[PDB]
Design a protein around this ligand. Sequence first.
Ligand SMILES: CCCCn1c(Cc2cc(OC)c(OC)c(OC)c2)nc2c(N)ncnc21
Length: 210
Amino acid sequence: EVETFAFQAEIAQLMSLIINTFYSNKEIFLRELISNASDALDKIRYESLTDPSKLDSGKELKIDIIPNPQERTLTLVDTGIGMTKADLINNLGTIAKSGTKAFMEALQAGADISMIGQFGVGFYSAYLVAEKVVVITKHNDDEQYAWESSAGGSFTVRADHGEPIGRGTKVILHLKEDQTEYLEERRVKEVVKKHSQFIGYPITLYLEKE
Ligand SMILES: CCCCn1c(Cc2cc(OC)c(OC)c(OC)c2)nc2c(N)ncnc21
């Protein structure tokens, strides 16, 4: 049971801009996604000081970065707060609306794409490198879900009955033909060092078996 939804026009326009614009400093996708993960981890950590049962779905607070050259994927797995069905379909796009507008206005007027994160739309920097993005997520108050979009103006949301993640978020970046450098841990390690060296959660960089 796949449900298909249209993005708001502005977010479809943001996505096209990110896909079509000539912009070589693509590696900032990684910083933004790790930051979203850190935020999510901050959130479940904070909530659990007043409700320690919020960790019954997992005590470890961590981020894993897993390259896979033959699937052509880069996965970022966190054990943060995760996302509900409502976030995926309605809530997150509602917040993103204003962020997308301010950002667009800032690009016009000569800000650049690396500044995307200051407007709360950093997630979409994934499309700098990924042809398709799949998000597996699990919040304590909800079922596990699979969110998916290859842009083109749509996303899908379905109940995911694959392996439980317990709590948190799996971002699977299906990378573009020309973006395979990010399937290498030596390249990923370099990008983590320049941008994300002080994240206050253990970031394990997996190694290709390849
Ligand atoms: C921007 C608010 C944060 C939403 N979010 C994000 C970024 C995000 C941002 C979204 O729109 C701005 C979005 O809807 C398309 C989304 O869904 C897949 C994700 N990553 C995480 C994460 N790893 N864990 C918990 N929440 C997250």
